[PDB]
Amino acid sequence: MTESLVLSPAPAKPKRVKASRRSASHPTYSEMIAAAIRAEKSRGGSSRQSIQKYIKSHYKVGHNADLQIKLSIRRLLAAGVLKQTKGVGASGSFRLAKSDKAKRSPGKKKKAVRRSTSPKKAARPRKARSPAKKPKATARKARKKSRASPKKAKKPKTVKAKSRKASKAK
Amino acid sequence: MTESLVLSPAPAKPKRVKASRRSASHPTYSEMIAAAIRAEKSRGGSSRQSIQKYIKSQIKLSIRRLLAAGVLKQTKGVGASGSFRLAKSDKAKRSPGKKKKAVRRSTSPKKAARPRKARSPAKKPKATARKARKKSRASPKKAKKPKTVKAKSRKASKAKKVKRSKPRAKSGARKSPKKK
Amino acid sequence: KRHRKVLRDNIQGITKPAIRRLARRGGVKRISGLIYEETRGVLKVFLENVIRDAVTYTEHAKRKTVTAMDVVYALKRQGRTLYGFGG
Amino acid sequence: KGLGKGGAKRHRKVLRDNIQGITKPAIRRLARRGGVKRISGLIYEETRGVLKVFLENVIRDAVTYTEHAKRKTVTAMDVVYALKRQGRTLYGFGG
Amino acid sequence: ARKSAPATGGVKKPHRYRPGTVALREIRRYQKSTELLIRKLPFQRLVREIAQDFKTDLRFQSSAVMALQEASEAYLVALFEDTNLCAIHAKRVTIMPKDIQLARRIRGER
Amino acid sequence: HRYRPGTVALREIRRYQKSTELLIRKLPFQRLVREIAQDFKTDLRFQSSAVMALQEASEAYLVALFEDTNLCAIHAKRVTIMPKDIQLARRIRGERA
Amino acid sequence: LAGNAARDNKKTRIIPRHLQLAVRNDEELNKLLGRVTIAQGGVLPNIQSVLLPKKTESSKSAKSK
């Protein structure tokens, strides 16, 4: 039909121009779902809210994208790209389809840092009490007074055992 | 769990250190090769010996573990060694794939082969412009000047629509190959 | 009685570990899912053919119960002979 | 080109060539009759051994049948009896 | 102390009793004893089921069912002998259903 | 001009199937038949019909075997038929008995 | 021959298994009485070499994988 390849692209051309180009400005048309999957970091990406909040940036909108999202996801599970799991409290469970048997019950696995913000609690009785407990996020507490080791820390850092003491004495 | 409880003293007392202030070093058995793959500077993927070089700062079991986790998609080859790459997700279709013979987007030529099937010729998987439906028997040096005459006969609005339409295909031609 | 007429209902639910034990008796170590269905089918086809001679022998003798002797006659006709159940 | 040039043989029979007379083209036609596209180089020697075993089993009964009849000629009736018992019953030789 | 035992919750296993070891243990036992692997009663129901369609007013003796079962079990085992040899010829031990197609075709059965 | 491998085989497949002929040469077969029976019994005579009957059974047995070994090759991924196929076919068919 | 198999089995009585033995071990006694089913006769321990991998119980490649 002419509507799909001649008429409709004409008004959306400026939106697509502002969208992804060779300058790596944005993800492509069929990879926004993959972007949602990698950025979700949860048990399952919600069908509506998560996808909207990860595609909130500037792209082809108003072009009936609220049907085009459905029409695009309607062509993804053919090659085993995405799959779904059951739930009670999630609007959607779109997940990456990979070598986890795709039929596994939820478990537990986490890996983050929380004692990384602990040595300010050691500098408090030792050095100073500048932070006032607010700046605990990643980009915060980077206003210098933020060090953990000697010069070698910026380069590949070492645990600097007793051998490093003799090396420094050298 | 001793493999992760009494061998956990190994990452508790390694002279090399990881997962500290700043991204100085990568966590063990996870996101270790992520930076190396992101800084690929290669076609098709990395190799086992090259990865041995990058890790300098159980490889097969780690690769299988990352496959099970779901972070790796690679390609198949024999002359190329290794072919290691992560999940960049620029285009998941890659249906042509080139190799010396392919079809442009496999849809617009299909949209042109559809009149072939509908009309008298009903050709095998070959697709061309409209004038072949009027004359199936054609030849170069002769089957192109009528197109220029038709373009001259048509209007500036049609010419502008022609300039505007396929730029969609210009944008799409970089999706699947991801590059030149 | 005689309330059962059609043979649509199947009571041929061969047990999976029995197939595994039968397969492992012959030296099998990895059995796929599709193997189980045809394994019953092979048994059904083999049982169907051997029983054709049994009924024909039974009807000739005007019997109501198939004896072990008739089975041996049917079995030895098809090339697979059993010993100890007839003679 | 002239003369044998190598591999020539002018020694027919004389306690030889009985089983080696089934040359490679002869085996090929039998393979092609059953329908093949390509055969390995080892199938030629194996075919001669396979054919001999089948012939040996049949002829063993045939000579036994002939001796019981107290005659020296071996007829098509004796060999077909061996085939019938084995299961490869052959028609067209019933007289 | 503790763990690294046959009890494992979210824990790496020591890679013991790999696929094949259980089979190697079982093949020795089952080939060492004479037994009827198929349960007796379901086979008795099976032989009754099939024979009823061919004719009615038909019963089976206790030895008759046993005679059919032993022949049927031996037929399956003998078939498993040929089909297993098909797998090794194809560099497999998975006895995938392509074996049964070739084994039955070679004999004058199917 | 030059026939690439496999081109003539397909033509020869469609020819031998519809033909009526003996593929084993007559003279070597007579010598083979006499020799194998010579050791079993010394003083023997062979009728022409018996030689013809033996050849037909021997050829048909090999032809039937070739069909099964062809289906043994299709079980694998190789068009070529190796001694692996023939020996396996003999065991399944009961020839090695 | 059946009595010899019983001695190896350490049981005096010829169990139908013992009769199944000495029939398949000898080809000459197998050419006779071949297409038969022995009642309550266990199969011979015929195992293919492919079923035993060995190779340090690890991957064909280097190291234990």
From Swiss-Prot, chain B:
SUPFAM superfamilies attached to this UniProt entry: Winged helix' DNA-binding domain (SSF46785)
One record GO biological process: chromatin organization
Highest taxon listed in the record's lineage: Eukaryota
Family assignment from sequence similarity: Belongs to the histone H1/H5 family.
Keyword tags: Chromosome, DNA condensation, DNA-binding, Nucleus, Phosphoprotein
Family matches, as Pfam families: Linker_histone
Species in which this protein is naturally found: Gallus gallus
Domain H15: 25-88
Protein's UniProt keywords contain Nucleus: yes
Modified residues (Phosphoserine): 23, 30, 136, 157
Gene Ontology MF terms in the entry: double-stranded DNA binding; nucleosomal DNA binding; structural constituent of chromatin
Subcellular location: Nucleus; Chromosome
Entry GO terms, CC: nucleosome; nucleus
CDD domains assigned to the protein according to its UniProt record, in alphabetical order: H15 (cd00073)
Organism ancestry: Eukaryota, Metazoa, Chordata, Craniata, Vertebrata
InterPro entries attached to this UniProt entry: H1/H5, Histone_H1/H5_H15, WH-like_DNA-bd_sf, WH_DNA-bd_sf
Record's function text: Histone H5 performs the same function as H1, being necessary for the condensation of nucleosome chains into higher order structures, and replaces histone H1 in certain cells.
Primary localisation category: nucleus
Statement: the UniProt record of this protein carries the keyword Phosphoprotein: yes
UniProt name for this protein: Histone H5
Region Disordered, residue ranges: 1-29, 77-180
Tissue: Erythroid cells.
Record's compositionally biased regions (Basic residues): 13-24, 94-180
Curated annotation (Swiss-Prot), chain D:
Modified residues (N6,N6-dimethyllysine): 13
A Pfam family recorded for this sequence: CENP-T_C
Residues bearing PTM N6-butyryllysine: 1, 5, 9, 24, 37, 70, 72, 84
UniProt superkingdom: Eukaryota
Glycyl lysine isopeptide (Lys-Gly) (interchain with G-Cter in ubiquitin) crosslink, residue number(s): 84
Location of N6,N6,N6-trimethyllysine modifications: 13
Positions bearing N6-lactoyllysine: 1, 5, 9, 24, 70, 84
InterPro entries given in the database record: CENP-T/H4_C, Histone-fold, Histone_H4, Histone_H4_CS, TAF_TATA-bd_Histone-like_dom
Subcellular location: Nucleus; Chromosome
Entry-annotated residues carrying N6-methyllysine: 5, 13
DNA-binding region(s), residue ranges: 9-13
Residues the record lists as Phosphoserine modifications: 40
Gene Ontology terms describing biological process: nucleosome assembly
Record keywords: Acetylation, Chromosome, Citrullination, DNA-binding, Hydroxylation, Isopeptide bond, Methylation, Nucleosome core, Nucleus, Phosphoprotein, Ubl conjugation
Oligomeric and partner information: The nucleosome is a histone octamer containing two molecules each of H2A, H2B, H3 and H4 assembled in one H3-H4 heterotetramer and two H2A-H2B heterodimers. The octamer wraps approximately 147 bp of DNA.
Protein name, as recorded: Histone H4
